[PDB]
Amino acid sequence: LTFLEYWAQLM
Amino acid sequence: NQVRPKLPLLKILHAAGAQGEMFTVKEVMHYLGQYIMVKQLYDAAAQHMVYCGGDLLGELLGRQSFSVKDPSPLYDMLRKNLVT
């Protein structure tokens, strides 16, 4: 979980 | 290279820390993920699900929910709101 690494697969 | 946010998308970037007028795709995404965290749009339970429906970002996405593990509606929106 954590939005932080979820939003780091895209970026 | 560098691109330019539109007036609807630039307002969303200047309300996260961005300052200027023109950025890179990659830093657009940084300040764009910042927005979801400052205005508290993401799901606290399943932290891949963003609930942008109520606010500008959703009206720009044409959605009211999207997952970060399937973010193709970002790349429908990232082509329509950036001048190359």
Q: Long-range contacts: B60-65, Cβ < 8 Å, 24+?
A: B60/B8, B60/B9, B60/B12
Can you read off the two tokens belonging to residue B28? 């657009």
- The neighbour count for residue B21, using CB atoms within 10 Å, is 10
Question: CB–CB of A6 and B47 under 8 A?
Answer: yes
Q: How far is CA B5 from the centre of its chain?
A: 11
Q: Which residues numbered 1-30 in B keep a CB inside 8 Å of some CB on A?
A: 26, 29-30
Which residues lie across from B4 on neighbouring strands? Answer: B83
Q: Which domain covers residue B45, as residue numbers?
A: 1-84
Q: How far is CA B35 from the centre of its chain?
A: 7
| HSE-CB for B9 with a 13 A CA cutoff | 23
Instruction: Report the CATH number at residue B84.
Output: 1.10.245.10
Considering its fold, how many domains does chain B have in total? Answer: 1
Q: B40 to chain A, minimum CA–CA distance in Å?
A: 11
**From the list B26, B46, B68, which residue is nearest A7 (CB)?**
B68
Record the resolution, in angstroms. Answer: 3.0
Per-position DSSP letters for B46-61, written without gaps between them: STTEE--TTSHHHHHH
Q: Which approach determined this entry? A: X-ray
